[PDB]
Amino acid sequence: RPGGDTIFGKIIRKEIPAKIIFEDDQALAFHDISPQAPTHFLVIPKKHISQISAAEDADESLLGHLMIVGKKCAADLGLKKGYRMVVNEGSDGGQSVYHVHLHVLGGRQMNWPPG
Amino acid sequence: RPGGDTIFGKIIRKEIPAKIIFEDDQALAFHDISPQAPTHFLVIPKKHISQISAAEDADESLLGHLMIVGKKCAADLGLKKGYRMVVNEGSDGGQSVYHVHLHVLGGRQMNWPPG
Ligand SMILES: Nc1ncnc2c1ncn2[C@@H]1O[C@H](CO)[C@@H](O)[C@H]1O
Ligand SMILES: Nc1ncnc2c1ncn2[C@@H]1O[C@H](CO)[C@@H](O)[C@H]1O
Ligand code: NA
Ligand code: NA
Ligand code: NA
Ligand code: NA
Questions:
Q1: Residues of B forming the active site
Q2: Which domains are seen in chain A, by residue range?
């Protein structure tokens, strides 16, 4: 199915709502349900890619688009002091949902190490 | 100057060495000098882009290339159990060096929140 077989497929098909902050033909951005910062949203491709380690060379422009969408949303949400972008792979990365997703976190000082 | 006026410009011009693990015409990957995980390396564009918030639409494919390079390096370094990718913007993101850089961390469980 367009959008894949994860939570995020359901969100892309609109079968379940999400607090959508951006949509184009390539990607969707929405607030995270378990926020770790005052602003915490996700940017996902509409194309099911299960994980970054499964992305192909021809996916570069889409992956970069996630990042540009994230920049735009961050500006729309007033993240003038900055933010952190995170992509988790696999079990050591803390990936729960096997559809690529870019986290964007801000509205507080982000610490180091990044987990 | 090609490569810009930061620490990372010096690295790109080879004026100072780094432990280089990948090089192509677009990007460079090298181990971080202050590692936060058993594997911790950086992927940078050779084009000076100061921060993600300064990237333009035409930079998408280069930004995605950083991510594909990171995937390749992670595989070369044996990160079979996964990893975390991080890009810091500005002061709240913890950005120190104003040349875009993608962190890739693995070889341990990464925690949550990501800072
Ligand atoms: N239905 C949902 N809407 C928004 N974010 C979600 C949903 N389900 C899981 N998440 C978020 O997806 C991320 C998966 O990395 C988590 O940070 C989690 O909180
Ligand atoms: N000369 C260098 N070689 C490799 N990594 C470096 C160098 N200088 C700074 N760094 C790393 O650059 C990152 C900037 O975010 C830091 O994690 C820091 O440790
Ligand atoms: Na798909
Ligand atoms: Na804080
Ligand atoms: Na340049
Ligand atoms: Na750990």
A1: 101
A2: 1-115 (3.30.428.10)
C-alpha closest to that of A69 among A38, A23, A108: A23
Which experimental method was this entry solved with?
X-ray
**B19-39 b/e with 16+ CB inside 10 Å = b?**
eebeeeeebbbbebeeebbeb
Residue B97 in contact with ligand 2 by CB distance below 6 A = yes
Instruction: Please answer yes or no on whether A91 and B83 come within 8 Å at the CB atom.
Output: no
Subunit contact B36:A114, Cβ cutoff 8 A: yes
Q: Is the peptide bond before B113 cis (omega within 30 degrees of 0)?
A: yes
Resolution, angstroms, 1 dp? 1.1
The structure tokens listed for B95 are 């950005």
Over the Cα atoms of chain A, what is R_g?
14
Q: How far is CA B68 from CA A60, A61, A72, in A?
A: 7, 11, 22
Q: Is the CB of A96 under 6 A from ligand 1?
A: yes
Report the distance separating Cα A33 and Cα B32, nearest Å: 33
Beta strand segments in chain B, E: 20-23, 27-31, 39-45, 83-89, 102-106
Partners of A61 on chain B (C-beta within 8 Å) are 60-61, 64
CA of A31 to the centre of ligand 1 (A): 8
A97 at B interface, C-beta within 8 A: no
